[PDB]
Design a protein around this ligand. Sequence first.
Ligand code: FES
Ligand code: FES
Ligand code: FES
Ligand SMILES: [Fe+3]
Ligand SMILES: [Fe+3]
Ligand SMILES: [Fe+3]
Lengths: 447, 445, 447, 193, 193, 193
Amino acid sequence: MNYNNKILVSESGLSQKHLIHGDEELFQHELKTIFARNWLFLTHDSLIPAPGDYVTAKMGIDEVIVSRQNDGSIRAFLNVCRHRGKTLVSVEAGNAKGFVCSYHGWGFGSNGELQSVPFEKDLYGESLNKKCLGLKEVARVESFHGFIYGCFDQEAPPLMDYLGDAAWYLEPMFKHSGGLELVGPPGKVVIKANWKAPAENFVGDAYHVGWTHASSLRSGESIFSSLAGNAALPPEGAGLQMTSKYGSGMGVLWDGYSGVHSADLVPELMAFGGAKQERLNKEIGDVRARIYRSHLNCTVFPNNSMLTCSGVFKVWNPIDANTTEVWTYAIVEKDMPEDLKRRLADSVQRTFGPAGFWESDDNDNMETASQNGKKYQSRDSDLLSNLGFGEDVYGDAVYPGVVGKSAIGETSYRGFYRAYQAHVSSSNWAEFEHASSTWHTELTKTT
Amino acid sequence: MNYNNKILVSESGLSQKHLIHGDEELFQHELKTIFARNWLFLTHDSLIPAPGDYVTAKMGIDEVIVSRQNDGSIRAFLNVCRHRGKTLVSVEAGNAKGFVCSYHGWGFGSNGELQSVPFEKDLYGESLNKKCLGLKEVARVESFHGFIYGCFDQEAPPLMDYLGDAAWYLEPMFKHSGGLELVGPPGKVVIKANWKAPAENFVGDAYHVGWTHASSLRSGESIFSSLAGNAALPPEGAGLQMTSKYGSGMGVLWDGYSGVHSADLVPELMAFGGAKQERLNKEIGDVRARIYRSHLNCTVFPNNSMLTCSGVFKVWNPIDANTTEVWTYAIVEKDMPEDLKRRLADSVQRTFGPAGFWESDDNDNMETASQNGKKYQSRDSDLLSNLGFGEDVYGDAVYPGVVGKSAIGETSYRGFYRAYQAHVSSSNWAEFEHASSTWHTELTK
Amino acid sequence: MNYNNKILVSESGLSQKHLIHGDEELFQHELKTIFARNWLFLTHDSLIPAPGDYVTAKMGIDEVIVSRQNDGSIRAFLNVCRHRGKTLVSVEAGNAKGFVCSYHGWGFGSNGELQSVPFEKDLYGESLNKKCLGLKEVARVESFHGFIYGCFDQEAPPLMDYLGDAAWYLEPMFKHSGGLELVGPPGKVVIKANWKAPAENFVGDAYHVGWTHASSLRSGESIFSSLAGNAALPPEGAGLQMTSKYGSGMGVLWDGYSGVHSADLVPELMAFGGAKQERLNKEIGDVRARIYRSHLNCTVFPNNSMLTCSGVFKVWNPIDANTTEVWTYAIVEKDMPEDLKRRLADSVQRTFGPAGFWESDDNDNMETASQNGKKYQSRDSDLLSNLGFGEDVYGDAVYPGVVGKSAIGETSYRGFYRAYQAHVSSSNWAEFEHASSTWHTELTKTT
Amino acid sequence: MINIQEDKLVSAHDAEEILRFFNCHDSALQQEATTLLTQEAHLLDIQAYRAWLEHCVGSEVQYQVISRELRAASERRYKLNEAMNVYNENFQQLKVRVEHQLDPQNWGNSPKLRFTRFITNVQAAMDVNDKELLHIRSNVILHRARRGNQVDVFYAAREDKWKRGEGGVRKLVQRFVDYPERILQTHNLMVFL
Amino acid sequence: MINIQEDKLVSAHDAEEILRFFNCHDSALQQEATTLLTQEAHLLDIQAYRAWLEHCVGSEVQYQVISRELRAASERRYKLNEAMNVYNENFQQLKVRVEHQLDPQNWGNSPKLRFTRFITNVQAAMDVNDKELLHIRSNVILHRARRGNQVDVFYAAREDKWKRGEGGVRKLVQRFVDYPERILQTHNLMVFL
Amino acid sequence: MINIQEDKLVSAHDAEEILRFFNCHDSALQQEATTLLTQEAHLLDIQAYRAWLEHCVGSEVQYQVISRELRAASERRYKLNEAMNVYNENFQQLKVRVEHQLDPQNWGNSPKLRFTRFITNVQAAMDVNDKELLHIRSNVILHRARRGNQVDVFYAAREDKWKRGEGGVRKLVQRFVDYPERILQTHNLMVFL
Ligand code: FES
Ligand code: FES
Ligand code: FES
Ligand SMILES: [Fe+3]
Ligand SMILES: [Fe+3]
Ligand SMILES: [Fe+3]
């Protein structure tokens, strides 16, 4: 396939070829143009708080060691020995000042340096230049209110610029709330779906909720219960959608602070969020303080998704075009009572974890949409994402980014796939930039 | 590999490269030139008899919904939602007037039409053109005495012409008997073989029976029992083999109406076939009535095979070059007594179903011939199909097609792989027709 | 990839690209330039001693029938019927004068000829030319002191010349001991590693032992026990390494005749080898008689490895770039007491078989170095094999080949990968010969 | 007991079967049932099919294994044949299959197959009307290995009826299995469950 | 008993549990335990979840399945949350899960799922302090099949506490499972272990 | 009994073993056998290998697991070594293996492995000559999980001899396994079956 020429994504992101969810060759090309180029979620301050704390994370299909240094900074390294390529670390988290390869015993620091080699002096004498044999390092590591992202491409935009207009919507909860903490260990399950199926679902899909999640809505009695089985439509002005230059976007459901949690947790959550909203009105104004306690369904491009207020935090780790390893954490506001944090964390796993009754409703949707992209008569078919097109705006006085002023639409799909097509047909960030110079105009075109 | 220039099948179908059973890239090319172009078995009238009745079926690796319309016609659609591509139906059969996608609730009719979209008016307003958003339809759907076939290519020949000379041999049992019915549900099993292994085996292989099936022949005491372990050869004039333009072909074993059934069913079947043959002599003459009650081992190109009289009906659904999902049904004459239908159907599954003791004798043959097609030193080797070559005729006064006048031979392999090679090296039906203008001359050379 | 131009191994074999252990397209090209071209281990006289005796063996991914003829010679044939391609033989060993295909009954002789076809006269008449329908035959079948190797390429060098300088080291144990026998049946296990990982490990890796095998060294009390966990370094002059033109090479550990065997067997083995050494001094001199009772860790290019004195004999049968089927046999000296042969064979399997406690310590090394070679950031990384480089010699007065005069080093890696790179970038034996005209000079370059 | 109007996923047939065992859980019957199934599995595992037919199977046996077509949970109109028989055998049909297994020209049985059966969850209850007839339910995991690297594992629930014949020997008179995977991924179902 | 300074791979929790069963192996208790687990698995297998909740589960139940983060065998400093709850349910939380299973708009339950449970290694021991409380340990293999060719097999050790409620019916009051595979390869863990 | 001239697939060794259990199926022996194997499986699963060696294994043990070469069903001439021993251990050889498992520099045991064993089909019968010697036969499914997504399942029939030593404790004196898959697909056979 010629990725320079092939139109995988039509103009304004209105449709995509179904083969994007199944073609193995394109998957291998995404490893170059998507996962080697873009910012990928690594960990949180709360998981590696002290010097020498480390976790292992995926970055695409590569695996990296993410380590808190003695000076408080964070560095991340390929989890691969510089001698004969063995995996250096085989646990998920720990604390150490160095990592010893169990093959020939080469000793690396927490700072990635090759510090010792067994019998160096008798074997290599002075020949071994240890300064050039440190662990391959992730070039860019940056934080967003404690959420740590990595990028292998040194030319990537700063993480804040990469979040673009989406950062404005996230900041009330991520920053003005006092800050979030990530609750580990994550649930981990493999689904037979492309990584883009869940990514698109979380970025912009409020349409599916009442139908796909009808049974979960009706059994649990959460605040959206009345949507079960499409019995009702969310009222005029129930929410909004947005998207941004580098692909991130989200839906906003006004006031839904208890999110998907069942009736048992609703009252405490609604009281906690209402009280904090009342204090934030004075710090950041009514609109931003209301965004804080509004449910955000977001995808941070390419493959990190979240539900603020529900507290679900997801990493769609790519294995091959029909295989994805799903990592599920909980995110909680640091100043909540510890007992409420625990219950919220359990509730996140109950709804969206490995035995999540909401997440399990989505499996067949994700897996068969993905597997149908390998089928001969569907490869060249068009997946549609035109709902709301012609009504999105840019430059609004209140809400930044390309915005669709209604709760249910496909604005965020269009911006996600516009950035995706610009990456896949570019060789580097400069070319992405050149291809994105009219991004908001292309997305608001008919408007 | 350049499929315009690569000789995969030699001249006259005499040999094929062993990589055709193992190469994944040629499997992907077969999707385009074999499975998107030819007629593929879908279902029977007996499995979707009433308005709204539907089954799902595979067409190559694609999966289709095959539905009986209110006017009595049958339409088939890709089992894929027009919105974000979810699989629409997840059961094998049922009855409905529409199909709702459980992802966002789009509702499609049995006729493929997008009939409803949740909250259309508030969400899409007037923007959604539902007329252009019907399910992707199978262009051609046609019946052969109740047996329903589909084809995605609008330029294909009519199904009767595609059967070419094979139809003549099938008509006594499919048409002049009163008609067959297909008994469902099919047994379903995955084997680690290419779809061409079993297809070639059923189309023309009477050679392997006495050796491969020696133990099943000896244990069950069916009418071919004396062949066990190659103890005897079928007598002079025991049968015949034929092949046709578009690839279908079959062997005939005169008079073996109880086919592979064991001794418990032989007498009733033989009496039932002998009586109907006596009535058909007057309708369609001695030859055609005798073909009725003779055992036909056929493959309808590319991947549907059957044993008439034994009543085995197979679909070799391709998964990848070394994986095939085998669907086994029973076919039974509509006017048999219901109790004899039931026993015949259980007997089809007993010998050739998922725990078939005959079909199980073939697994290692199919699977290791297929897997050996991936091995370096065998990719470029030649699989031979030259038995009987030089003795086939065309234009015979009694038996039409390219016919070889003896029971054991490879005439039907050669026709099957000649048609296979003309499709693989052609871009459309017009080029197949130009590559097949001397088909019977190339085979009788 | 273009493999004339694609440079996978740097000059003097100092480093290799990590994708050589994971690239599926290179695996398919190794089938053509490694496994269709070189000599591959088949069997031993001791497993097919009588007329009609046969075994099945792999040659790369192909499977062959290896049969003792009536005249005492050995012939090998593809295990594939000439008719419609069914696997002919489905057992591992037996005795027969012919093989009948169970598909249509074609009957082939032990000499590969098509002897009978069911109902030939009535069906084929005179048309079938049986003389042209014999089983496809391995062109080249040769013996090294009872060890039978096969090669599909009629242009290959004679087996003795292909062993090159390594044959000198092997001959004291393989020939001057009176000869070895192979003890069957082999253990058979599938590992998720590239065939090169174990081949490299056995050819030249003494460095890993003390660290990788620390626990095996410390639990069993063998002669290398003091190396456990890198507590000690083998003394100056403990051993040597060598490599040769066609890739075979080995480490030598002076006097280690009981090899990996635990305390229970040490004293008997040491008495047996010392006594035989004392008689060999007169036949072949002190040096060669000491090589006889010194532990050799060898790989016979490409994928046959062995430990003399420990008695381990391995075949690393390639399945795909991360899958290898490991066959393990024992090798014993023919004149040992039968009860000793039995105990030595069980001890081989105990340490290096399917439940071998030493072999098990290597699994994670092999499997993760192999699997990391598929990961995006590691494909183009360099695996290092420069230990000892600049000290190897050639043309020594005592030890032939390219020789590094110390027990721990990577000389044998360099010579293995130099020959590997010359095969992969050549189309035939003449081109390998042209690319290997300065083989020892390139390897001893800075010496 | 099961209220299948409230317990909406349960079939009428499954609700009947559990009713039979939730009452009577007699210790002597359990031990007899366990012994019967353990010895039957032993014979089958070492491929002593003639002895299995002689000592464990009744002459009036109905040995049946079905595969049921996948239908909508809400289906009420489509009513064509719901299941096909993978097995549906009488004594003589079993004997043909045992002859086929022991025939020396059964090429698929060389090298010899290896079978290991795991029988669990044994429940036993006497029939109300026929006091010589014992209902035994059990689950089986069957592992079949052959030819180096071919491995097939079968899983199922078995509804049996075992009856005292002559000698006082309790023999299999009905086995019914509703095979749980609709598309087999074990190459065939040619094993005795 | 276990000396966990010498038996260095054993956890303190595992050493405690084995101490409870290695002593008292009472025959009547074993048979009661076996009967309880076999009937509970039968109900679950035929998807009678309401009946399971009514007859086998206590109102004070804690139904917990954890997934434990993988850490160095020598780790001593890192002490953040070790495990996450796949399940950590009270009776009402189970009831929500049962309603979600039986809802006719639970699209993933059409065609109906097929479940087969294999319960083995049953051990029973009365609690020292609470004489109405029985500790039952058992191991389960759970096979779930659906939609033609999806097949998921779960494996696990179950540490239960069963208590006599009213009626004299012994009901589940605590189930604890430390799920042995860290990364699930079964699409989800939506089954009742 | 088995007539191996008629039951042609049965080996002489398998015929002998079934003869020993088809007779005596003593209830007290069955319960003792079941308890022995369940406790032994429990110790092994929690990786208490020293305790396993101390409480379940006799000092005269022969712990043996073979892999048998695949030969023609009709083979009668080729008679070279038929099997190799994956295990063939005395007590001291088991001790070296247990040390190797507990050594802190056994890198493959970090993160800790997870083991679950499923023991079924237990048969027990006293030896005719040695009245302190009990023959126990049982089948095992062993699940081994490690390092996130490595999963290895082992299947086998075990032929054991258990003998009363001092204390009256019945201990393992012989275990024989003929491992059913010729080519292992579990990375190794480093588990105690
Ligand atoms: S591979 Fe890590 S020290 Fe050698
Ligand atoms: S994918 Fe079918 S309605 Fe959206
Ligand atoms: S495939 Fe061997 S005789 Fe036909
Ligand atoms: Fe959802
Ligand atoms: Fe056949
Ligand atoms: Fe090693």
